[PDB]
Amino acid sequence: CTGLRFTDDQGNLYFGRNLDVGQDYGEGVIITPRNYPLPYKFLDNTTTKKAVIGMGIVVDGYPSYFDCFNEDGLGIAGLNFPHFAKFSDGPIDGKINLASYEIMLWVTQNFTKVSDVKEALKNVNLVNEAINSSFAVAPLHWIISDKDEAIIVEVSKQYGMKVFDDKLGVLTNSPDFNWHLTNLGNYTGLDPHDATAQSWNGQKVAPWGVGTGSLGLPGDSIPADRFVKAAYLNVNYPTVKGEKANVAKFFNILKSVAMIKGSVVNKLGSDEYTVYTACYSAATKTYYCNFENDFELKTYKLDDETMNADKLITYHHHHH
Amino acid sequence: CTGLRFTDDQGNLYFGRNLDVGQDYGEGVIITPRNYPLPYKFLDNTTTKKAVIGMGIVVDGYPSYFDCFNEDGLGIAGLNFPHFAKFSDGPIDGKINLASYEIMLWVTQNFTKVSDVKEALKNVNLVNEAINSSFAVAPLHWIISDKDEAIIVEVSKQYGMKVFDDKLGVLTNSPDFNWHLTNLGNYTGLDPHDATAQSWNGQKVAPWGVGTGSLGLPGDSIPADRFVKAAYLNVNYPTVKGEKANVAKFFNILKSVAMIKGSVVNKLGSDEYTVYTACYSAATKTYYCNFENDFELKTYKLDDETMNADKLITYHHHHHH
Amino acid sequence: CTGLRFTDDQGNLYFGRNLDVGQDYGEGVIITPRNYPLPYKFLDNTTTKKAVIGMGIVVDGYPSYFDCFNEDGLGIAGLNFPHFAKFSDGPIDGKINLASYEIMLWVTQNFTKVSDVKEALKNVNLVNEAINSSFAVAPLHWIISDKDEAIIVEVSKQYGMKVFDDKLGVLTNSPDFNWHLTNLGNYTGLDPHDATAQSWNGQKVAPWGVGTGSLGLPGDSIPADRFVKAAYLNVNYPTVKGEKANVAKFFNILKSVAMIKGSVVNKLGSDEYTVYTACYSAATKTYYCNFENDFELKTYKLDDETMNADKLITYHHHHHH
Amino acid sequence: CTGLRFTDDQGNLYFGRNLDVGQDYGEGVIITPRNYPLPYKFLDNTTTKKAVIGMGIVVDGYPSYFDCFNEDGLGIAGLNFPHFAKFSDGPIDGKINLASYEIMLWVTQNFTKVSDVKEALKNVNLVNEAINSSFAVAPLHWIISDKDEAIIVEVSKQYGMKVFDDKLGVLTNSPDFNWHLTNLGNYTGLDPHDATAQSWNGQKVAPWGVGTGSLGLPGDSIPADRFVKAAYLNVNYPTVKGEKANVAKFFNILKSVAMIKGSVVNKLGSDEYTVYTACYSAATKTYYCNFENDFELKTYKLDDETMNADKLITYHHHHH
Ligand code: NA
Ligand code: NA
Ligand code: NA
Ligand code: NA
């Protein structure tokens, strides 16, 4: 998995992710309308006040999102953080206690600004607790973004709860976010500008084509390598104008660091690959995605009809 | 540029390319119908006998293709081959003489099997002659494919004319094709299979995520590195079923090795990037494409209307750079 | 700099380092005998009780070691830790307070087991104090080893004081040690075993020579890359028998990751390179070393003469830079 | 294997090689004096006119050299060229026909200048013929050097006999020399100069230590990678003065690209590693070497005693 965000020139946000998995989770697009029942394990039950859209599954009427985005332009994506993620073994007195899966809707239902999320997370405790008996707790970390800033939320057995500002606009998987940030200093030799002809003791040594400035840029799917590549691409990609160009830019970057089917076989014998790429445009309230076996962009929208529906709106699962 | 071909389980061909350039050329999609006038610099002028589709420009009524594909399922793509490509000073008596730009139509008009193209090429001579004085001769090499085999055609100052079988189904830019083939032996350490946990003198060293067996796979846009990655992806991608799945597999692979805007600045100061990605599906006679600033797939078809049109059918030019 | 330790089949320790710098420091080999005066900034002044040998300079009669090893087979080496290393503003009541330069002698004089060093360090405080106003406080971290275990000591602004067990037997420079350890998981794809011939869609792709399983092993002098390579070599080098074979194995490994003159120019314009490589053999109490411009092994020994000398024994300084 | 040459400021040559093998060949240092019997398979038998030194084996009184150097400052080293090397299946009329193993002494006995070797090789045919019944033909290519130039001699089934000028002063193994030269253009992004701090969308990304300019320099033992690294090191290493400094420089470079024991296991189950590193100094007529298990430099010399001996002078085989 790779998460990505950036803005156009006028602060319109484009924010999304690749889902890179080794099995089928049965997910599909889900629109949660306003005034939908919203239970909490350790807080008063309530109802949604904001409509949200994203990809996920429905568990006894609870929309469990892999990524979701509210009508006000703030979203969150959950990505794998194995060997690090570890939540509290029980709620703590005086904290805002959330089972780790509840963070998706807690963030999208109560906030519109990342700066506010940041202040609220100072009294939040994430609890190691599953939705129900037949689910395990997923070892996730999260990227949260509005149009002004993105933060990384990580709760690990190594370091506890840490919240990072993410100026690169990217997130992958393990190890922890500061490790990845530190790793970038080893890639300062990268340069978009091509090299030119040289004399190696009088032997002409010259580029055969363009691209020689990025010698050393990794192209495999190791999380640290996708991180370096996605970060490099995102910060050097110019700002572009309009919905079509920005959506295209989003998919150009994430299809570049996609995990290609057949190139990764996990230790259990299964292919791991990017099953879908998705982008939320806050300006149009539109969720764009495509699939490993179906490349044309699909669109799903928060609008006056869907934001006010009486039930969840769920699209059949796209068969991988 | 990266060219790519493969087939599905029924022998349906999927064949196309990325165009990675640093300036605008005015190109767009062009259908050339049957019975369209076809001049030759050094051969008897004639008319097209098969319809073709692809990307290119029209120069004084002559469709000059970047890539093109005939209704019988054989296609060709021209890619840059700098510091190598060199053609004859003039025509040669006894040979089939073509200005190098004429090879696109000469191949798509006269053949349906790459086997026949291979035999005819033994008597072909490519000439260093431009279409007119406004254009320079482009230093190209070519990939040609039907459903059964793909070949690379390179005509160089170093080696003369060479024709290679291309079992990898990929082509990029310089150096020459046998150089790239030889390079693959240096990457036999790549493995789709993940590593597992190890004991480094009792220190547990274990992967953090999947992908560890492809350690060393280059991610940059140097032609050698795009060749290795593109070949590695193509040969390990499973054969898939149906038009939608195969077209998506094509774009999945070529977008993986696309040259991303902002990441490559040439020595003249211009961004080099993939301005379009195109796929020809021989089974539906459909040309698919999308662009750096417009990701939706656009489709264009050779069918009973377009193949018997009375003129060139030209779609508008999408601006870039 | 790269520090390295391992043992032979009998538990004889071989422990030393490369010094990779961009200027001359005047260093040379120094034997400090037993019963030599030993002042402390924040502790009762005393005398040495064990003889030590290593590389360093003498400042007003005080041997300031870059690395040093005591007659009981425990040693320590200081390596650069920039952008991390930070020590206390002043001493702290109740702690064993040391100016950071005093750690070399404090360790080699008071311990023979790394286990005891580990316990004492829980009450140690390192102070940001130079030896005098002519020298700046060096931003060091340390590797300490006996025959049984090696530890890394890092005192940083980011993390305070940390002590790590070092099963890899290696240390380089920044970032912090847990960062490097974590990095190793990304290199689980490395394999000493050669690849063999493969079929890439029927194209034979086969190694041209041995070594193909270590595809992706970095060859540059970035501290992260020297750490990965040095750890990989050390853990896969077989245990060897005898003094000559073990000393050679040591130099084989450290010369593999040496920083070669001319290949690294720092932002101030100076060449950074390995000016010397040194190995302490605990079994013979012998310090071996050679230099960038003099490859013969020079040897210096702690024995009954040098350990009971009446003064510091200093060998001449070999000029560099 | 890696071969290396360079000169000091006054044209004194330093020239040698690593031997990287997976088994023991029983080789040792051999001095061949003047007037020693020198048979040829396809030419008149003669005697040596120049003394030579180097590493090799003795086969029925014939010194079969892995590398050797004549008293006049010209040397040759044979290195592996598998899957390419292919010699003539029989002598050709009108050519100077040499069985491929005879080239070592033919070059060192008849020439002092590489420019002369170059002209003579135009009428030379290398023949696929073993020393005797119990030896196979080794698939070698060669590096030949005097103080002014080095050439690469390659006879392959792909390309026939080719002779290259070698301004890099290095040679490894397969593939062919022009392939390696072409490969350097892909590494033009390498720079000895360190990178400096950068702003990745306002995130400080800065080197943690020196060395960042050579991002992408390979450190494994694949022949193409040792070639790139050795070439880079040799052309950026400054010229140095005097015998000690130049011998040290030689070993610094070749120990850097050495094949370290335990890091390479071949498909038959054996470790491959650098068993010896050797350097001939033409100025002192001294052959320096050390070994994987014995690091102190050993020296062997062409002098008035050894150049005029009555038999071969052979040192017992160093046991690996
Ligand atoms: Na509740
Ligand atoms: Na004509
Ligand atoms: Na004191
Ligand atoms: Na004879």
Side-chain angles (χ1 to χ4, degrees), chain A residues 1-112 114-118 120-240 242-243 245-295 297-300 302-304 306-310 312-318 320, chain B residues 1-92 94-156 158-240 242-243 245-295 297-315 317-321, chain C residues 1-92 94-156 158-240 242-243 245-295 297-315 317-321, chain D residues 1-112 114-118 120-240 242-243 245-295 297-300 302-304 306-310 312-318 320:
Chain A
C1 282
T2 311
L4 171 74
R5 54 87 64 207
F6 58 81
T7 53
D8 69 359
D9 36 293
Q10 333 197 112
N12 297 302
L13 176 67
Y14 297 82
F15 180 26
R17 57 96 64 77
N18 289 340
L19 187 78
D20 304 351
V21 288
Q23 53 171 111
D24 192 345
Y25 289 92
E27 77 291 349
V29 172
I30 303 164
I31 290 166
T32 305
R34 307 149 170 164
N35 317 299
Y36 192 79
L38 182 58
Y40 281 100
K41 288 288 177 95
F42 310 107
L43 313 163
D44 289 347
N45 297 3
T46 186
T47 66
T48 67
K49 310 290 191 266
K50 302 176 193 286
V52 303
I53 186 166
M55 193 87 63
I57 65 180
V58 175
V59 181
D60 288 308
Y62 191 93
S64 325
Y65 279 109
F66 299 14
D67 41 76
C68 67
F69 310 83
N70 70 18
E71 52 176 293
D72 298 321
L74 181 141
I76 183 172
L79 283 73
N80 222 14
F81 193 31
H83 316 289
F84 280 82
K86 200 251 170 207
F87 310 124
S88 291
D89 292 319
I92 295 177
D93 293 303
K95 291 292 182 180
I96 299 168
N97 295 288
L98 302 162
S100 63
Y101 74 88
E102 300 179 322
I103 199 185
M104 308 297 281
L105 285 168
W106 184 81
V107 165
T108 54
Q109 283 312 310
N110 300 294
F111 305 93
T112 65
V114 163
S115 60
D116 292 325
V117 179
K118 249 163 98 143
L121 284 175
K122 303 178 163 162
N123 205 39
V124 161
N125 177 61
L126 292 191
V127 175
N128 169 37
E129 159 89 25
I131 171 57
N132 66 37
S133 278
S134 83
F135 283 96
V137 180
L140 305 182
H141 63 172
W142 302 267
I143 172 161
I144 309 176
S145 189
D146 64 24
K147 67 173 180 82
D148 298 302
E149 55 184 300
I151 54 169
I152 300 315
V153 171
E154 277 177 355
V155 186
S156 68
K157 52 170 152 163
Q158 293 86 346
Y159 310 124
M161 155 156 27
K162 293 264 177 289
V163 179
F164 302 92
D165 190 51
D166 190 354
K167 292 171 182 92
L168 293 323
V170 299
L171 185 69
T172 62
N173 309 104
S174 296
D176 59 287
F177 192 66
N178 186 61
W179 185 98
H180 290 289
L181 286 177
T182 308
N183 191 34
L184 292 182
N186 304 319
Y187 287 88
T188 48
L190 293 170
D191 189 349
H193 304 272
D194 284 341
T196 45
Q198 295 158 26
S199 167
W200 292 35
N201 188 50
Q203 169 72 53
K204 199 215 206 178
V205 172
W208 293 110
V210 298
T212 50
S214 298
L215 165 73
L217 185 71
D220 57 272
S221 298
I222 297 169
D225 292 344
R226 295 185 281 106
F227 186 98
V228 170
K229 180 162 179 180
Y232 188 63
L233 297 186
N234 199 23
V235 307
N236 288 111
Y237 211 119
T239 307
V240 307
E243 176 88 341
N246 274 281
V247 172
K249 155 178 174 172
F250 187 95
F251 276 83
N252 294 332
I253 288 163
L254 276 199
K255 293 305 199 191
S256 179
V257 303
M259 201 183 283
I260 305 306
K261 189 185 188 132
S263 70
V264 183
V265 183
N266 66 27
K267 64 184 174 245
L268 287 182
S270 288
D271 287 343
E272 303 241 358
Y273 58 100
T274 299
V275 302
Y276 77 77
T277 301
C279 172
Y280 182 74
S281 172
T284 62
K285 304 194 207 300
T286 304
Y287 185 86
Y288 302 80
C289 62
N290 78 353
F291 301 106
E292 183 273 335
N293 58 8
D294 187 348
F295 204 78
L297 291 196
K298 296 94 174 64
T299 57
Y300 311 87
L302 286 182
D303 64 44
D304 286 332
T306 65
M307 294 201 267
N308 300 289
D310 60 298
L312 296 183
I313 297 157
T314 54
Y315 290 74
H316 289 186
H317 164 62
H318 175 101
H320 305 328
Chain B
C1 288
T2 308
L4 174 70
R5 54 88 66 204
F6 57 83
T7 57
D8 74 355
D9 59 310
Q10 313 260 126
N12 295 305
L13 177 64
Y14 293 87
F15 179 27
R17 59 91 68 69
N18 284 337
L19 188 75
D20 314 339
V21 284
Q23 76 192 62
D24 199 345
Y25 293 92
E27 66 276 16
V29 174
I30 304 165
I31 298 175
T32 297
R34 301 154 178 170
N35 297 128
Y36 192 85
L38 180 49
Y40 283 94
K41 295 275 214 233
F42 315 102
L43 301 162
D44 287 343
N45 299 9
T46 184
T47 51
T48 69
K49 284 335 177 296
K50 316 165 183 283
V52 299
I53 189 166
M55 195 80 67
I57 62 169
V58 184
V59 174
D60 298 294
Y62 188 93
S64 328
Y65 280 106
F66 300 12
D67 40 78
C68 65
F69 313 83
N70 72 22
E71 49 172 297
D72 293 316
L74 183 132
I76 176 166
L79 281 68
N80 228 29
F81 192 28
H83 316 289
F84 278 81
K86 199 221 165 60
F87 319 115
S88 289
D89 290 323
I92 293 174
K95 303 217 109 188
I96 305 171
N97 291 276
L98 304 156
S100 62
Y101 75 90
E102 298 179 312
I103 192 133
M104 314 285 301
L105 284 175
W106 182 83
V107 163
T108 50
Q109 288 311 308
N110 294 284
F111 304 97
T112 63
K113 302 190 207 243
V114 171
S115 55
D116 297 329
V117 178
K118 266 207 264 201
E119 205 59 28
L121 276 172
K122 300 171 165 161
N123 202 42
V124 157
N125 183 249
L126 298 192
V127 180
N128 180 32
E129 165 123 351
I131 201 176
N132 59 46
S133 59
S134 291
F135 294 86
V137 166
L140 302 184
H141 62 175
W142 301 267
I143 175 169
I144 300 166
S145 188
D146 60 22
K147 56 174 191 103
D148 301 309
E149 47 190 297
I151 56 165
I152 306 307
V153 177
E154 285 178 349
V155 180
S156 62
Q158 291 90 340
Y159 306 130
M161 178 188 256
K162 309 296 278 210
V163 189
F164 304 92
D165 185 53
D166 186 355
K167 291 193 187 48
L168 290 317
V170 300
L171 186 76
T172 65
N173 306 104
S174 304
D176 55 285
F177 189 71
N178 183 62
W179 187 96
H180 294 290
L181 281 177
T182 305
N183 194 26
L184 294 181
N186 299 321
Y187 287 91
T188 46
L190 297 170
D191 192 3
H193 296 281
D194 280 342
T196 62
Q198 304 151 12
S199 180
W200 291 35
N201 188 47
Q203 174 72 32
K204 188 179 182 180
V205 179
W208 295 110
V210 303
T212 39
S214 284
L215 178 66
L217 180 76
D220 56 270
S221 281
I222 301 167
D225 292 346
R226 282 188 287 111
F227 186 95
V228 168
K229 176 154 177 179
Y232 184 64
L233 293 185
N234 203 27
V235 303
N236 290 120
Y237 213 117
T239 301
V240 299
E243 176 88 350
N246 275 276
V247 171
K249 157 181 179 177
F250 189 95
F251 278 82
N252 290 336
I253 294 167
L254 276 197
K255 292 310 197 184
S256 173
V257 299
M259 195 185 296
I260 303 306
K261 187 176 211 201
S263 67
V264 181
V265 187
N266 65 29
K267 57 187 182 341
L268 289 177
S270 312
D271 286 357
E272 310 250 351
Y273 62 96
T274 298
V275 303
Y276 75 81
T277 301
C279 174
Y280 180 72
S281 168
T284 64
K285 297 191 216 295
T286 301
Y287 188 83
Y288 300 82
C289 57
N290 78 352
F291 302 88
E292 179 275 332
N293 62 350
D294 187 348
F295 207 82
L297 289 196
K298 287 141 200 97
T299 67
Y300 311 86
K301 191 155 177 144
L302 289 174
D303 57 29
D304 277 344
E305 305 299 290
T306 54
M307 293 190 283
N308 305 294
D310 63 346
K311 47 163 98 50
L312 293 180
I313 309 174
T314 59
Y315 304 86
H317 161 69
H318 196 141
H319 284 266
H320 59 84
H321 281 92
Chain C
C1 288
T2 308
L4 174 70
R5 54 88 66 204
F6 57 83
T7 57
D8 74 355
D9 59 310
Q10 313 260 126
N12 295 305
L13 177 64
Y14 293 87
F15 179 27
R17 59 91 68 69
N18 284 337
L19 188 75
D20 314 339
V21 284
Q23 76 192 62
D24 199 345
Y25 293 92
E27 66 276 16
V29 174
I30 304 165
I31 298 175
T32 297
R34 301 154 178 170
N35 297 128
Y36 192 85
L38 180 49
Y40 283 94
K41 295 275 214 233
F42 315 102
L43 301 162
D44 287 343
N45 299 9
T46 184
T47 51
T48 69
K49 284 335 177 296
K50 316 165 183 283
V52 299
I53 189 166
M55 195 80 67
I57 62 169
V58 184
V59 174
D60 298 294
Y62 188 93
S64 328
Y65 280 106
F66 300 12
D67 40 78
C68 65
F69 313 83
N70 72 22
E71 49 172 297
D72 293 316
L74 183 132
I76 176 166
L79 281 68
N80 228 29
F81 192 28
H83 316 289
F84 278 81
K86 199 221 165 60
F87 319 115
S88 289
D89 290 323
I92 293 174
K95 303 217 109 188
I96 305 171
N97 291 276
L98 304 156
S100 62
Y101 75 90
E102 298 179 312
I103 192 133
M104 314 285 301
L105 284 175
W106 182 83
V107 163
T108 50
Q109 288 311 308
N110 294 284
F111 304 97
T112 63
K113 302 190 207 243
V114 171
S115 55
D116 297 329
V117 178
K118 266 207 264 201
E119 205 59 28
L121 276 172
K122 300 171 165 161
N123 202 42
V124 157
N125 183 249
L126 298 192
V127 180
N128 180 32
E129 165 123 351
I131 201 176
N132 59 46
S133 59
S134 291
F135 294 86
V137 166
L140 302 184
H141 62 175
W142 301 267
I143 175 169
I144 300 166
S145 188
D146 60 22
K147 56 174 191 103
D148 301 309
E149 47 190 297
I151 56 165
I152 306 307
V153 177
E154 285 178 349
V155 180
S156 62
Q158 291 90 340
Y159 306 130
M161 178 188 256
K162 309 296 278 210
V163 189
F164 304 92
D165 185 53
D166 186 355
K167 291 193 187 48
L168 290 317
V170 300
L171 186 76
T172 65
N173 306 104
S174 304
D176 55 285
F177 189 71
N178 183 62
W179 187 96
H180 294 290
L181 281 177
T182 305
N183 194 26
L184 294 181
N186 299 321
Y187 287 91
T188 46
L190 297 170
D191 192 3
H193 296 281
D194 280 342
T196 62
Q198 304 151 12
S199 180
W200 291 35
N201 188 47
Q203 174 72 32
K204 188 179 182 180
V205 179
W208 295 110
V210 303
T212 39
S214 284
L215 178 66
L217 180 76
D220 56 270
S221 281
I222 301 167
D225 292 346
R226 282 188 287 111
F227 186 95
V228 168
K229 176 154 177 179
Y232 184 64
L233 293 185
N234 203 27
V235 303
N236 290 120
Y237 213 117
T239 301
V240 299
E243 176 88 350
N246 275 276
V247 171
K249 157 181 179 177
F250 189 95
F251 278 82
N252 290 336
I253 294 167
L254 276 197
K255 292 310 197 184
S256 173
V257 299
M259 195 185 296
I260 303 306
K261 187 176 211 201
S263 67
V264 181
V265 187
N266 65 29
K267 57 187 182 341
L268 289 177
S270 312
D271 286 357
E272 310 250 351
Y273 62 96
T274 298
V275 303
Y276 75 81
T277 301
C279 174
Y280 180 72
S281 168
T284 64
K285 297 191 216 295
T286 301
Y287 188 83
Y288 300 82
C289 57
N290 78 352
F291 302 88
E292 179 275 332
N293 62 350
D294 187 348
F295 207 82
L297 289 196
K298 287 141 200 97
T299 67
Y300 311 86
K301 191 155 177 144
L302 289 174
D303 57 29
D304 277 344
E305 305 299 290
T306 54
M307 293 190 283
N308 305 294
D310 63 346
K311 47 163 98 50
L312 293 180
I313 309 174
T314 59
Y315 304 86
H317 161 69
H318 196 141
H319 284 266
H320 59 84
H321 281 92
Chain D
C1 282
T2 311
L4 171 74
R5 54 87 64 207
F6 58 81
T7 53
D8 69 359
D9 36 293
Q10 333 197 112
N12 297 302
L13 176 67
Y14 297 82
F15 180 26
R17 57 96 64 77
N18 289 340
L19 187 78
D20 304 351
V21 288
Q23 53 171 111
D24 192 345
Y25 289 92
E27 77 291 349
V29 172
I30 303 164
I31 290 166
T32 305
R34 307 149 170 164
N35 317 299
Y36 192 79
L38 182 58
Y40 281 100
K41 288 288 177 95
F42 310 107
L43 313 163
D44 289 347
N45 297 3
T46 186
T47 66
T48 67
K49 310 290 191 266
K50 302 176 193 286
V52 303
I53 186 166
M55 193 87 63
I57 65 180
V58 175
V59 181
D60 288 308
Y62 191 93
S64 325
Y65 279 109
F66 299 14
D67 41 76
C68 67
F69 310 83
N70 70 18
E71 52 176 293
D72 298 321
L74 181 141
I76 183 172
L79 283 73
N80 222 14
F81 193 31
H83 316 289
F84 280 82
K86 200 251 170 207
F87 310 124
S88 291
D89 292 319
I92 295 177
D93 293 303
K95 291 292 182 180
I96 299 168
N97 295 288
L98 302 162
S100 63
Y101 74 88
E102 300 179 322
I103 199 185
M104 308 297 281
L105 285 168
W106 184 81
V107 165
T108 54
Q109 283 312 310
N110 300 294
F111 305 93
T112 65
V114 163
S115 60
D116 292 325
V117 179
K118 249 163 98 143
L121 284 175
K122 303 178 163 162
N123 205 39
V124 161
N125 177 61
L126 292 191
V127 175
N128 169 37
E129 159 89 25
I131 171 57
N132 66 37
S133 278
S134 83
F135 283 96
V137 180
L140 305 182
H141 63 172
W142 302 267
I143 172 161
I144 309 176
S145 189
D146 64 24
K147 67 173 180 82
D148 298 302
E149 55 184 300
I151 54 169
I152 300 315
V153 171
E154 277 177 355
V155 186
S156 68
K157 52 170 152 163
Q158 293 86 346
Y159 310 124
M161 155 156 27
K162 293 264 177 289
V163 179
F164 302 92
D165 190 51
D166 190 354
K167 292 171 182 92
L168 293 323
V170 299
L171 185 69
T172 62
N173 309 104
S174 296
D176 59 287
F177 192 66
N178 186 61
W179 185 98
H180 290 289
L181 286 177
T182 308
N183 191 34
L184 292 182
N186 304 319
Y187 287 88
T188 48
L190 293 170
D191 189 349
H193 304 272
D194 284 341
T196 45
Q198 295 158 26
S199 167
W200 292 35
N201 188 50
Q203 169 72 53
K204 199 215 206 178
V205 172
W208 293 110
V210 298
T212 50
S214 298
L215 165 73
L217 185 71
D220 57 272
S221 298
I222 297 169
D225 292 344
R226 295 185 281 106
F227 186 98
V228 170
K229 180 162 179 180
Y232 188 63
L233 297 186
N234 199 23
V235 307
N236 288 111
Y237 211 119
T239 307
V240 307
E243 176 88 341
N246 274 281
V247 172
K249 155 178 174 172
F250 187 95
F251 276 83
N252 294 332
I253 288 163
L254 276 199
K255 293 305 199 191
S256 179
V257 303
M259 201 183 283
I260 305 306
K261 189 185 188 132
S263 70
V264 183
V265 183
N266 66 27
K267 64 184 174 245
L268 287 182
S270 288
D271 287 343
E272 303 241 358
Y273 58 100
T274 299
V275 302
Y276 77 77
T277 301
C279 172
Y280 182 74
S281 172
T284 62
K285 304 194 207 300
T286 304
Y287 185 86
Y288 302 80
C289 62
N290 78 353
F291 301 106
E292 183 273 335
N293 58 8
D294 187 348
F295 204 78
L297 291 196
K298 296 94 174 64
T299 57
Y300 311 87
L302 286 182
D303 64 44
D304 286 332
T306 65
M307 294 201 267
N308 300 289
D310 60 298
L312 296 183
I313 297 157
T314 54
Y315 290 74
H316 289 186
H317 164 62
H318 175 101
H320 305 328

